[PDB]
Amino acid sequence: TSLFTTADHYHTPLGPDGTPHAFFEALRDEAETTPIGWSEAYGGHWVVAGYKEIQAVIQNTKAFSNKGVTFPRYETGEFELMMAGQDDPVHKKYRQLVAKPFSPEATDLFTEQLRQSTNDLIDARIELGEGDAATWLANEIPARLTAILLGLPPEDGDTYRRWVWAITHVENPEEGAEIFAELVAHARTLIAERRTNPGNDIMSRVIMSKIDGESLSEDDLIGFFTILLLGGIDNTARFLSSVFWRLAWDIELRRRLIAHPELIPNAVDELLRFYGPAMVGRLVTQEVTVGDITMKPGQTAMLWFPIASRDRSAFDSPDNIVIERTPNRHLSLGHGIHRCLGAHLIRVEARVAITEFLKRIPEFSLDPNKECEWLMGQVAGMLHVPIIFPKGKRLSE
Ligand code: HEM
Ligand SMILES: CC1(C)O[C@]2(C)CC[C@H]1CC2
Q1: DSSP code for 124
Q2: Mutate which of 235, 275, 348 to test ligand 1's pocket (most atoms within 8 Å of Cβ)?
Q3: Domain spans of the chain, in order of start
Q4: Ligand 2 midpoint to CA 345 (Å)
Q5: Whose CA is nearest to atom 1 of ligand 1?
Q6: Buried-state track 149-158, b at ≥16 Cβ within 10 A, e below 16
């Protein structure tokens, strides 16, 4: 009996705790014998579970193309994801356009506004003594951050979330395409507006940019817009929700982060290893052998990062969250040329999220009368995290 045969990142068996982690652990155990397995899901594809096997695939850009980065493909109409859905040299040229504003020295400029924002969000419910940490904080912190990066109105998080849902989760493909078409319409307007009155934001920047003497097509710009929006409203929101969930019941982890704030960055790294929501696909472009398996052009490999992150040959006590873990060479933010662009910014954002929350609400728990909900997908993490806590006081009247 092989767990690879019906492995499906959108349909992962959930254990009693609410998460797919029992299943991830079982699959990790099997992968010690079989690091790469065939799944009959999505018409048939390779599932890459072993840590060193994922490293081998991800370093091989000659045989594995990022044209298959989403599998099954995200609903983005005729548009593609900039950087993430491209290979070199096209890929490298586009990333260079936004390398500078995503560098650590540039993104640190947001840190104090991130603290203020997180605190203002906490204000909204602290007097109430209950709330969904996902909808209330985990979703909102990166949505607002993302809106600032894209030069969008920060109060329209619900609109941006509807678009993201269409791209990633809506099942009816007519609706999904229709709703992605709305994004495109809003994106065209914004681009036209930044064209005449540019600002400091990333969109303004890329609109004013030039590759090989030529300005980018509108479709390219829409691609930039789309992936950046995804990085925030999907990936970060789900990661932060899972973290809030863990802190809600794991009183031992919680008291330590409060007692050792100097440990928070390292714990964020460990949390990324443990609750890293993402998996990515690769399109096989030439015959290639990895370990025991020979893959063929046209086939797709899903890189199951969460399983690699629990590989006993790469991490000691992989099933434990050890906040002092170092080094921690997890794959939650990718590796190689497609390594997460947000990287340092997401670390700072997670650090601030956690620090201010524990500072304001050091005691809380899961709501016994409302259900948690895990969202399965290529990006997987908690969607609803209802909590209760002793009523507090706002900082800002
Ligand atoms: C917890 C939050 C996040 C996680 C877990 C995550 C995960 C990842 C992973 C695993 C990759 C590798 C893709 C591959 O190998 O094909 C990647 C790439 C990428 N990420 Fe994210 N991400 C997060 C947040 C963000 C944010 C906030 C942004 C931007 C605002 C962003 C922008 C990008 C871009 C542009 C790429 C492609 C870079 C390239 O192709 O060179 N991400 N991400
Ligand atoms: C899952 C992940 C990491 O996020 C996006 C936005 C970028 C790369 C892939 C696919 C889509």
Answers
A1: T
A2: 235
A3: 1-397
A4: 16
A5: 236
A6: bbbbeeeebe
Instruction: Pull the structure tokens for residue 174.
Output: 């007519």
Burial of residue 262 (CB within 10 Å: 0-12, 13-18, 19+) is exposed
Q: What SS3 state is found at 211?
A: strand
Ligand 2 pocket mutation pick from 71, 169, 234, 330 by most atoms within 8 angstroms of CB: 234
Residue type, 101: P
Q: Is 372 annotated as a binding residue?
A: no
The DSSP line for 35-96 is SEEEE-GGG-EEEE--HHHHHHHHH-TTTEEGGGSSSSPP--TT---TTTT--TTHHHHHHH
From the list 340, 176, 253, 246, the residue with the least C-alpha distance to 21 is 246
Residue with tokens 């969202």: 375
What are the angstrom distances between the C-alpha of 347 and each of 209, 250, 272? 28, 21, 9
Q: Are 274 and 309 in contact (CB under 8 A)?
A: yes
Which CATH code fits 1-397?
A: 1.10.630.10
What kind of experiment solved this structure? X-ray
Cα 314 from chain centroid?
Answer: 22
User: Per the structure block, which two tokens stand in for 250?
Assistant: 């794991």
Spatial distance between the Cα atoms of 351 and 115, rounded to a whole number of angstroms = 10
User: What's the reported resolution, in angstroms, to a tenth?
Assistant: 2.3
Q: How much distance in Å is there from the Cα of 225 to the middle of ligand 1?
A: 13
Task: Say which residue the tokens 């969904």 belong to.
Answer: 132
